[PDB]
């Protein structure tokens, strides 16, 4: 369980828009850890790893 730190607008290509404060579930990471595949109420897709952090 994670929370978004900053807004991120999807740039297509299976990225996912997220808003500061939203909760996410993390499925995994790409090969260099820069991208994170996450699930929110809005769907599923890749977000910047640095834009989220664990919560609770």
């Amino acid at each position: 369980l994670f929370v978004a730190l900053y807004d991120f607008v999807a740039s297509g290509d299976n990225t996912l828009s997220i808003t500061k404060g939203e909760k996410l579930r993390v499925l995994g990471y790409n090969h260099n850890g820069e991208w994170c595949e996450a699930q929110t109420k809005n769907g599923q897709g890749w977000v910047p790893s640095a834009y989220i952090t664990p919560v609770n």
Partner: peptide, 10 residues
């Protein structure tokens, strides 16, 4: 995942 890097945190 995208082949390009994500934006840096603000």
């Amino acid at each position: 995942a995208p082949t390009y890097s994500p934006p840096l945190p603000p």
